[PDB]
Structure formats: structure tokens, C-alpha cells
């Protein structure tokens, strides 16, 4: 099954850098979402939870056909909270009703990764809407209670090795865990709406203790009032891990370098592009543009 990316009729890059600056522009505005964290950090999730439902063995789910606007998807237990992610895009979707699903869900991600000081993320664009009935069944998305080997089998059904799990990882310094999204609560860093390394530093630097929350889960918890998933913790657990978390907790370029990488190949998986397809956009933030 092959979907081969198709540039919206007579679009260009000053089209998406539109697209890009109305969503950067909501996300000034909107700041109040969500205690003050702002719509960043559940923007970065929506792009993360549309694109890996992929399954490299039979390309089935992936961000091309923006299938989450659709019942199934959108209602899968594991996307829980998205809805606001989904909100938010609505009117930008409406003023710019020719960019796809797909692309508009990407978008978002590297738009609000870019805002919140983070890498630059090259972005594609040619993601097509396919039909209701290509939208993967719940069930392809992670579970937060497991360990260090499931992570690392799970993320290989998206083609991630070590590196880049471990690189994909540290966008869990945004947002926070909310008990009734997920049964899981708290912020797992103090910046929370501002792209850092922190993740890392705090896995390695912070006191830890396993406790269990309000959901009857157990979570690590700082005194300073952090926590970390399971999935989190496995990855200082795991000795391979352990080496590339403190990699990045040493060293913000790297971070940046290959989670960049790492989250436009997410966003990619899935498309094949053609030969003559546009090179991927860098959008300009809206700080560069004055704006
Ligand atoms: C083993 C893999 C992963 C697991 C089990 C996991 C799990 C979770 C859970 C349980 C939450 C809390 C949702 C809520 O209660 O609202 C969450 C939030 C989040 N995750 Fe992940 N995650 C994983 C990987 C990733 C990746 C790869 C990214 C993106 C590159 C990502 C980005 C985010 C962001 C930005 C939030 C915060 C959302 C918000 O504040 O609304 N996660 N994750």
C-alpha cells in the first residue's frame, strides 16, 4: 500500500508559512489552555499520536491520511485529551480548508515545537486524505506501565532504533500528565511550554520515588513536583538507554540535532516522495519574521 505524497494544487512554500504563522499566532493568543502551559505541548502530542500508529510491516496508519478526524480514531482511549489539539486546529483549518488532514496535524507539531524555542524540524508537505475506512483500529499507540524491552519492540514497528526513541522521548520536558486523560498526573519539568534538554536532566538529577497516584498507577515522583511514566524511568533502567540519556542531558545541540531528525521522520513515515517533490520546508518562527 503506497501513498505518494501530492502537493496541494498550485501550494509553495509561502502557502505553509502562512499556515504555519496563523497556528503560531493561536498559540500567543490561546495562552491560557491548560493552566497557562498553553496549546504547545498537546499540538506536539496530536502530530506525535496521528503519525505513530504506522506499522512499517504493511503501511497501514501513519500521518498521511489524517484519518483522527474521523470517530474511531479520535475516540481511541489512547488519545484522550487530543480532542483539544483537534479544537484548536479547527479554525485554522477553516481559513485554509486546501491543506490536507495529515499535513495540518503535522503542521501543528513542528509549529509548536519551533515556537517553543525548539530545533528547526524540515517539514513536507503532500499528505492526502484517505477514506474513513483506512483508519487503524485503536490499540497501535504505547502503553505508559511497561518496561525498558517493551519500548524498545514497540518502536520498532516505527522503524526507531535507541537514538531516536531516546531523542523522541525528551518532548515528554512539554505539557504534563493529566489523571483523567491518561491516569497518570503532573508535569514532568519545570519548562514545560519551552523546548529544553530537561527531560534528560531531571531523569539523571532529580530524587525518584516510586509511589502511586489518585488512578491507583504507580509513577515516579520528585520533591520537587515531577514525575516520570514508567516508560520514562525505563530508559535510565536500560544501559543502552542510560548512555544516550546522558548524551543528552550533556549536550542541548545533540538533543535538538536528532530529535529533529527523528520527529520529521515520524512525521514521514509511511510517504513515499517523489523524485521531483519540493525539498522540505524550514518555517520561519514568527520571532524571525518580526511577527
Ligand atoms: C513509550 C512512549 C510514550 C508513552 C507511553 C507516552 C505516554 C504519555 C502519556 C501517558 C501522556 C499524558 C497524556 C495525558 O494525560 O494528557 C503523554 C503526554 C505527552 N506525550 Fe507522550 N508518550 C510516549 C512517547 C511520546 C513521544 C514519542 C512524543 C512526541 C515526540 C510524546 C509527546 C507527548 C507530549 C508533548 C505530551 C504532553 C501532552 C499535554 O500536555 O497535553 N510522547 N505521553
Redesign the pocket.
Given at each position: 500500500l503506497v501513498h505518494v505524497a501530492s502537493v496541494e494544487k498550485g501550494r509553495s512554500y509561502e502557502d505553509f508559512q502562512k499556515v504555519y504563522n496563523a497556528i503560531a499566532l493561536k498559540l500567543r493568543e490561546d495562552d491560557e489552555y491548560?493552566n497557562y502551559?498553553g496549546y504547545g505541548?498537546?499540538l506536539?502530542?496530536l502530530a506525535?499520536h496521528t503519525s505513530?500508529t504506522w506499522d512499517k510491516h504493511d503501511n497501514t496508519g501513519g500521518s498521511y491520511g489524517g484519518t483522527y478526524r474521523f470517530k474511531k480514531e479520535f475516540n481511541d482511549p489512547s488519545n484522550?485529551?487530543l480532542q483539544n489539539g483537534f479544537k484548536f486546529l479547527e479554525p485554522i483549518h477553516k481559513e485554509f480548508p486546501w491543506i490536507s488532514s495529515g499535513d495540518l496535524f503535522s503542521l501543528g507539531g513542528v509549529t509548536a515545537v519551533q515556537e517553543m524555542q525548539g530545533p528547526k524540524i524540515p517539514w513536507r508537505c503532500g499528505r492526502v486524505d484517505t477514506p474513513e475506512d483506512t483508519t487503524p483500529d485503536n490499540g497501535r499507540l504505547?502503553?505508559?506501565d511497561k518496561d525498558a524491552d517493551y519500548?524498545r519492540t514497540?518502536f520498532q514497528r516505527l522503524n526507531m532504533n535507541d537514538r531516536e526513541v531516546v531523542a523522541?522521548?525528551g518532548?515528554?520536558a512539554?505539557?504534563?500528565?493529566?489523571?483523567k486523560?491518561?491516569g497518570?498526573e503532573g508535569p514532568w519539568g519545570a519548562a514545560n511550554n519551552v523546548f529544553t534538554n530537561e527531560f534528560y536532566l531531571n531523569l539523571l538529577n532529580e530524587d525518584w520515588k516510586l509511589e502511586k497516584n489518585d488512578a491507583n498507577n504507580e509513577q515516579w515522583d520528585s520533591k520537587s513536583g515531577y514525575m516520570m511514566?514508567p516508560?520514562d524511568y525505563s530508559l535510565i533502567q536500560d544501559p543502552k538507554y542510560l548512555s544516550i540519556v546522558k548524551e543528552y542531558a550533556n549536550d542541548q545541540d545533540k538533543f535538538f540535532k536528532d530529535f529533529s531528525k527523528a520527529?520529521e521522520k515520524?512525521l514521514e513515515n509511511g510517504i513515499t516522495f517523489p523524485k521531483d517533490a519540493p525539498s522540505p520546508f524550514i518555517f520561519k518562527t514568527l520571532e524571525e519574521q518580526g511577527l
Open positions: 491548560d502551559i505541548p498537546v506536539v502530542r506525535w505513530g484522550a485529551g504505547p502503553d505508559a519500548v514497540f523522541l522521548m518532548a515528554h512539554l505539557g504534563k500528565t493529566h489523571l486523560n491518561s497518570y511514566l516508560t520527529f515520524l
